[PDB]
């Protein structure tokens, strides 16, 4: 009764939900045909799958997932791949023409035909969850269905469910290497729905994950699998206290309390510490004090922001494997000695620890070495206000010559949203500077 | 009550834990603790062997 | 440097394993793993190959059970 | 005949009390199932202080376990002695608090308070002459401190003559693991001062400073921090279950400790703890036991009584031991060191001797001390409340539960009275 | 009539007091035959 329904929006959302969900089949016992082979003579004791998987009478487990796309070519690979009996046939929603790198198509014209069907499979997957923690949102800021329709997905979910948790994991655009031109018109105009209609918000950039996977692992020339695989190792470690036993257990409600001071202010940074290769797992001991301080490194963050520019508001550690409470508490005190990490004037306590038991699961065909410890850390920092400042520049640069604007205002999208949802960002960029300034 | 005022009661006495395998060291007698580790070194050694083979 | 500093006739090869090791499905040993039943944070043990899976059979309510 | 109804709340309260019952059940010869398998006769004579009777000669404790999350009931039910508890005594809600005093006090902990008070009123009226209650909780979490003070308020409005006692684990200052804990602890001390008879202060920092310095353990855990809290949870109530040359119950130590009804925060400590290599190098005599009650390192609070004045002092001695040597050594500590003692109380020491030691031991000793060096335990909470509160830091988590900012402002100054009430007796 | 009703109520008791297989289940052996016949058609 610790359920979470995942919602995957877009080709970024779908292809992340192919790599999250082959992790959760191997993490538990479930195969691609749905059966749990260890269910015979050992049953009832393993209630760990109940967060993500749903049982039928035949011993077949069906996920709590909804895959959404506005193009047919992405989900049709999922519909006939290896995992084609794992997913219910009606949980994979597809349109006929995509939103085509355009906010207003996926919001005002083309997304109006799928919101009536998707919002009915959400009701059927939340009328069997007796206690639902909250939804999970996997989308991309830059596409058309990932940005246009998610802003219309979230806006109904405020009304439809009220005050349940709506966590989001997004792909904010990279500040240097992008794969679009109309990218900043989308990413600006969806800030006003990740501001109101999100309860927490995690914004990784795929250029930062390229830096880690080239350097910390040894995959020169990686593809999008090795990026999806690392994102799955964070969503599991956030929810690993909902399924396996822990000395200290922290829930999705419980770090919401301990990370967001004010409800305008919910944008932390995700950093998963031991990402090393199998050859360089031979040469490195991987103790508790040695991975708890690689989270804080400005070369391992998965957003292209440096936390030395700003002040930590709160932090949330998530230890896993063979740790001890005596040593989690021993290496937190080291971080507080150094000036190079500094906390804010009004947060004297600072942290929230969580200690799990079951160590993380290696994936065959994967790349990370099989280790015995890990850390996942979700810190809230004033130095995230630079990442919207390297994209403030590229909206008004293109908008001052009024380029590409006929592709939006001919879709039934009014003109005043450009001058407003940017001046929306002209106060959330000034909100973050004042909530860090030293007291009078 | 001569035993309270023996001149040699300190000689004619036993410590509360002669060795780690002694019978009178229970939970309520707070000489024996659970988190002392004598299996520490062997467990660390087999951890290193397991790491090497992985 | 190759001709001068070369060292041969050494006891070559890594030490023998004395057990079969596969890195795919073998988990490291820990203080926690060797002392698994006598730990304060460990739930009911009813799974093989990993003791640390959550077992919430005692705590689920009688309305909501299997 | 002098029954004690145990209450215990939260993950901290359900993991302290589970080890404490493993201490008592061995002390009275009770198996993991419940049956009596002892040897002496004194083990089965005053067992009704803590144990009821079931059918077939099986004894079940008077413990009511309280929690807001359902995951610390499975930890306790399937532990070492989890089969001795009656399953109706477990109380659990299906959603937690999550480090929040308001959800503990108003929002979530008020729908669960009216089902525990139907349990405790069934266990408190089933005693022939109920001596009092107990509590075990922590001032850092949500259900230990939020609803854990809602319960005490309902008890002392319903059974005012009976004794209410608390073993508070107040939050550790410098090994801390919650940002939002000083809101919980500052809001919870007004409810301690008006509704408790006694209250003990425990810091988990000063339970680590025993296990590193004194016992020289390699890898301590929380199983060896609960192992020490139960050592002094049983020495306070050992003259109620076993006879002695001089008795003292939970009330006689309360009569003799508090001079004014707002000054009841104490500092326990347990004497014969010996490191494993130094075990054979020590002998068990009387001055070996009063050199480690009164040693300032030994105390189970992270505050030092050399900075303040001992208002009164207790001592509980267990064993078969001499009444002259008991009495002459407590005059001895009063006279060498007479600036750590208040002037206006001439004798500051209460003493009690019980005969039946802990199992496998010859002698033992316990302490309870009242200090003006415990107003240094609240000013390190006040400095980290108004540093954080003056910029309205985590306030939206608390005010949106149905509170007001003036409710904070009174809990500033009601705890700041106890800083300055205690201060005028150092003058 | 009476023996038929008594055997029917005993087998009904046996098939309903399996608590899992009452509130959930199906007939996989019949459903394989049905999908085979539909493929043939």
UniProtKB/Swiss-Prot annotation, chain A:
Modification sites for N6-acetyllysine: 40
Residues annotated as binding GTP: 10-12, 15, 71, 99, 140, 143-146, 179, 183, 206, 224, 228, 252
List of catalytic residues: 254
Example GO biological process: locomotory behavior
UniProt-annotated binding residues for Mg(2+): 71
Record Gene3D superfamilies: Helix hairpin bin (1.10.287.600), Tubulin/FtsZ, C-terminal domain (3.30.1330.20), Tubulin/FtsZ, GTPase domain (3.40.50.1440)
Keyword DNA damage annotated: no
Tissue note: Ubiquitously expressed, although primarily in lung and brain.
Main localization, broad class: cytoplasm
Any matching Pfam family: Tubulin
List of residues that carry 3'-nitrotyrosine: 282
Enzyme Commission designation: 3.6.5.-
First-tier enzyme category under EC: hydrolase
InterPro entries, per database record: Alpha_tubulin, Tub_FtsZ_C, Tubulin, Tubulin/FtsZ-like_C, Tubulin/FtsZ_2-layer-sand-dom, Tubulin/FtsZ_GTPase_sf, Tubulin_C, Tubulin_CS
Keywords tagged on the record: Acetylation, Cell projection, Cilium, Cytoplasm, Cytoskeleton, Flagellum, GTP-binding, Hydrolase, Isopeptide bond, Magnesium, Metal-binding, Methylation, Microtubule, Nitration, Nucleotide-binding, Phosphoprotein
Annotated compartments: Cytoplasm, Cytoskeleton; Cytoplasm, Cytoskeleton, Flagellum axoneme
Keyword check for Lipoprotein: no
PROSITE patterns (UniProt xref): TUBULIN
Catalytic activity: GTP + H2O = GDP + phosphate + H(+)
Residue(s) carrying Phosphoserine: 439
Cofactor (UniProt): Mg(2+)
Family per record: Belongs to the tubulin family.
Protein's job: Tubulin is the major constituent of microtubules, protein filaments consisting of alpha- and beta-tubulin heterodimers. Microtubules grow by the addition of GTP-tubulin dimers to the microtubule end, where a stabilizing cap forms. Below the cap, tubulin dimers are in GDP-bound state, owing to GTPase activity of alpha-tubulin.
Name used for this protein in its record: Tubulin alpha-1A chain
Species classification: Eukaryota, Metazoa, Chordata, Craniata, Vertebrata
Curated annotation (Swiss-Prot), chain B:
Subunit structure: Microtubule inner protein component of sperm flagellar doublet microtubules.
Localization annotation: Cytoplasm, Cytoskeleton, Cilium axoneme; Cytoplasm, Cytoskeleton, Flagellum axoneme
Protein name stated in the entry: RIB43A-like with coiled-coils protein 2
Family to which the UniProt record says this protein belongs: Belongs to the RIB43A family.
Function, as annotated: Microtubule inner protein (MIP) part of the dynein-decorated doublet microtubules (DMTs) in cilia axoneme, which is required for motile cilia beating.
Organism, as annotated: Mus musculus
Top-level lineage group: Eukaryota
From Swiss-Prot, chain C:
Protein name from the UniProt record: Sperm-associated antigen 8
UniProt region (Mn 2), positions on chain: 1-12
Organism of origin: Mus musculus
Assembly, per entry: Microtubule inner protein component of sperm flagellar doublet microtubules. Interacts with FHL5 (via second LIM domain). Interacts with RANBP9.
Role, per record: Microtubule inner protein (MIP) part of the dynein-decorated doublet microtubules (DMTs) in cilia axoneme, which is required for motile cilia beating. Plays a role in spermatogenesis by enhancing the binding of CREM isoform tau to its coactivator FHL5 and increasing the FHL5-regulated transcriptional activation of CREM isoform tau. Involved in the acrosome reaction and in binding of sperm to the zona pellucida. Plays a role in regulation of the cell cycle by controlling progression through the G2/M phase, possibly by delaying the activation of CDK1 which is required for entry into mitosis.
Tissue: Expressed in testis (at protein level). Not detected in brain, heart, kidney, spleen, liver, lung, thymus and colon (at protein level).
Similarity field: Belongs to the SPAG8 family.
Residues of the full protein shown: 367 to 432 of 470
Membrane spanning residue stretches: none
Subcellular locations according to the entry: Cytoplasm; Nucleus; Cytoplasmic vesicle, Secretory vesicle, Acrosome; Cytoplasm, Cytoskeleton, Microtubule organizing center
Swiss-Prot record, chain D:
Binding-site residues for GTP, renumbered to this chain: 11, 69, 138, 142-144, 204, 226
Phosphoserine: residues bearing it: 172
SUPFAM superfamilies (alphabetical): Tubulin C-terminal domain-like, Tubulin nucleotide-binding domain-like
Modified residues (Phosphothreonine): 55
Entries under InterPro entries matching the protein: Beta-tubulin_BS (IPR013838), Beta_tubulin (IPR002453), Tub_FtsZ_C (IPR008280), Tubulin (IPR000217), Tubulin/FtsZ-like_C (IPR037103), Tubulin/FtsZ_2-layer-sand-dom (IPR018316), Tubulin/FtsZ_GTPase_sf (IPR036525), Tubulin_C (IPR023123)
Keywords: Acetylation, Cell projection, Cilium, Cytoplasm, Cytoskeleton, Flagellum, GTP-binding, Isopeptide bond, Magnesium, Metal-binding, Microtubule, Nucleotide-binding, Phosphoprotein
Short motif MREI motif, span: 1-4
Cofactor: Mg(2+)
Entries under SMART domains matching the protein: Tubulin, Tubulin_C
Main location per the UniProt record: cytoplasm
N6-acetyllysine modified-residue sites: 58
GO molecular function, one term: double-stranded RNA binding
Location relative to the cell: Cytoplasm, Cytoskeleton; Cytoplasm, Cytoskeleton, Flagellum axoneme
SS bond list: none
Top-rank taxon: Eukaryota
This protein's record includes keyword GTP-binding: yes
Record remark: domains: The highly acidic C-terminal region may bind cations such as calcium.
Function as written in the Swiss-Prot or TrEMBL entry: Tubulin is the major constituent of microtubules, a cylinder consisting of laterally associated linear protofilaments composed of alpha- and beta-tubulin heterodimers. Microtubules grow by the addition of GTP-tubulin dimers to the microtubule end, where a stabilizing cap forms. Below the cap, tubulin dimers are in GDP-bound state, owing to GTPase activity of alpha-tubulin.
Descriptive protein name: Tubulin beta-4B chain
């Amino acid at each position: 009764m610790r359920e979470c329904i995942s919602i995957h929006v877009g080709q970024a959302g779908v292809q992340i939900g192919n790599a999250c969900w082959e992790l959760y089949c191997l993490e538990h016992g479930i195969q691609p045909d749905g059966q749990m082979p260890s269910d015979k003579t050992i049953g009832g004791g393993d209630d760990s799958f109940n967060t993500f998987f749903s049982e039928t009478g035949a011993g077949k487990h069906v996920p709590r997932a909804v895959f959404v796309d506005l193009e047919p070519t992405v989900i049709d690979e999922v519909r006939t791949g290896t995992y084609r009996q794992l997913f219910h046939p009606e949980q994979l929603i597809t349109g006929k023409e995509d939103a085509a790198n355009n906010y207003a198509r996926g919001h005002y014209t083309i997304g109006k035909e799928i919101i009536d069907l998707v919002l009915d499979r959400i009701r059927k997957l939340a009328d069997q969850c007796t206690g639902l923690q909250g939804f999970l949102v996997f989308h991309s800021f830059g596409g058309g269905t990932g940005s246009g329709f998610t802003s219309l997905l979230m806006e109904r979910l405020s009304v439809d469910y009220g005050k349940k948790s709506k966590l989001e994991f997004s792909i904010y655009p990279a500040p240097q290497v992008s794969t679009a031109v109309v990218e900043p018109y989308n990413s600006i105009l969806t800030t006003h729905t990740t501001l109101e209609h999100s309860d927490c918000a995690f914004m990784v950039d795929n250029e930062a994950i390229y830096d880690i996977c080239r350097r910390n692992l040894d995959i020169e020339r990686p593809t999008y699998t090795n990026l999806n695989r690392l994102i799955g190792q964070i969503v599991s470690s956030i929810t690993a206290s909902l399924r396996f036993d822990g000395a200290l257990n922290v829930d999705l409600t419980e770090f919401q309390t301990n990370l967001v001071p004010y409800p305008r202010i919910h944008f932390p940074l995700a950093t998963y510490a031991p990402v090393i290769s199998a050859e360089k797992a031979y040469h490195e001991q991987l103790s508790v004090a040695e991975i708890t301080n690689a989270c804080f490194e400005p070369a391992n963050q998965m957003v292209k922001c440096d936390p030395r520019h700003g002040k930590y508001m709160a932090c949330c550690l998530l230890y896993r494997g063979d740790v001890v409470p005596k040593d989690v508490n021993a290496a937190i005190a080291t971080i507080k000695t150094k000036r190079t990490i500094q906390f804010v004037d009004w947060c004297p306590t600072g942290f929230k620890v969580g200690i799990n038991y079951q160590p993380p699961t290696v994936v065959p065909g994967g790349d990370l070495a099989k280790v015995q410890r890990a850390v996942c850390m979700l810190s809230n920092t004033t130095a995230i206000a630079e990442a919207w400042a390297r994209l403030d520049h590229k909206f008004d640069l293109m908008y001052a010559k009024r380029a590409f604007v006929h592709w939006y205002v001919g879709e039934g999208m009014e003109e005043g949203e450009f001058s407003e949802a940017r001046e929306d960002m002209a106060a959330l960029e000034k909100d973050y500077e004042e909530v860090g300034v030293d007291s009078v | 009550e001569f035993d309270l005022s023996d001149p040699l009661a300190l000689q004619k006495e036993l410590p509360a834990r002669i060795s780690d395998n002694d019978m009178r060291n229970t939970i309520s007698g707070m000489q024996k603790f659970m988190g002392e580790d004598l299996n520490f070194q062997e467990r660390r050694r087999f951890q290193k062997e397991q790491s090497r083979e992985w | 440097t190759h001709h001068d500093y070369r060292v041969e006739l050494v006891r070559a090869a890594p030490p023998a394993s004395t057990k079969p090791h596969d890195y795919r499905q073998e988990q490291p040993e820990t203080f926690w793993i060797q002392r698994a039943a006598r730990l304060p944070g460990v739930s009911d043990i009813r799974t093989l190959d990993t003791p640390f899976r959550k077992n919430c059979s005692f705590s689920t309510p009688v309305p909501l059970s299997l | 005949m002098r029954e004690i109804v145990h209450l215990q709340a939260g993950q901290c309260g359900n993991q302290i009390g589970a080890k404490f019952w493993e201490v008592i059940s061995d002390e009275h010869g009770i198996d993991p199932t419940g049956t009596y398998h002892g040897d002496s006769d004194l083990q089965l004579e005053r067992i009704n202080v803590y144990y009821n009777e079931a059918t077939g000669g099986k004894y079940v404790p008077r413990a009511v376990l309280v929690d807001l999350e359902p995951g610390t009931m499975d930890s306790v039910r399937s532990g070492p002695f989890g089969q001795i508890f009656r399953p109706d005594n477990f109380v659990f809600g299906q959603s937690g608090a999550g480090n929040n005093w308001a959800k503990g006090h108003y929002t979530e902990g008020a729908e669960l308070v009216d089902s525990v008070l139907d349990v405790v009123r069934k266990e408190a009226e089933s005693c022939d002459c109920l001596q009092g209650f107990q509590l075990t909780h922590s001032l850092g979490g949500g259900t230990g401190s939020g609803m854990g003070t809602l319960l005490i308020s309902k008890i002392r409005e319903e059974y005012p003559d009976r004794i209410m006692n608390t073993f508070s684990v107040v939050p550790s200052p410098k090994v801390s693991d919650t940002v939002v804990e000083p809101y919980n602890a500052t809001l919870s001390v007004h409810q301690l001062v008006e509704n408790t008879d006694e209250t003990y202060c425990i810091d988990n920092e000063a339970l680590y400073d025993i296990c590193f310095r004194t016992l020289k353990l390699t890898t301590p855990t929380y199983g060896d921090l609960n192992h020490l809290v139960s050592a002094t949870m049983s020495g306070v109530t050992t003259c109620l279950r076993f006879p002695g040359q001089l008795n003292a119950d939970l009330r006689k130590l309360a009569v003799n400790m508090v001079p004014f009804p707002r000054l009841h925060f104490f500092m326990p400590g347990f004497a014969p703890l010996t490191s494993r290599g130094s075990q054979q190098y020590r002998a068990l005599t009387v001055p070996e036991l009063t050199q480690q009650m009164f040693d300032a390192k030994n105390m189970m609070a992270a505050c030092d009584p050399r900075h303040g004045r001992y208002l009164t002092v207790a001592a509980v001695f267990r064993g078969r031991m001499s009444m002259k040597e008991v009495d002459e050594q407590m005059l001895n500590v009063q006279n060498k060191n007479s600036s750590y003692f208040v002037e206006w109380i001439p004798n500051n020491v209460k003493t009690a001797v019980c005969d039946i030691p802990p199992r496998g031991l010859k002698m033992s000793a316990t302490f309870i001390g009242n200090s003006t060096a415990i107003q240094e335990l609240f000013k390190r909470i006040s400095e980290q409340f108004t540093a954080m509160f003056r910029r309205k830091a985590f306030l939206h988590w608390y005010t949106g539960e149905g509170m007001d900012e003036m409710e904070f402002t009174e809990a500033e100054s009601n705890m700041n009275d106890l800083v300055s009430e205690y201060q005028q007796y150092q003058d | 009539n009476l023996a038929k009703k008594r055997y029917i109520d005993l087998c009904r008791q046996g098939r309903i007091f399996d608590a899992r297989n009452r509130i959930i289940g199906g007939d996989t052996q019949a459903w394989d035959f049905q999908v085979r016949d539909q493929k043939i058609k």
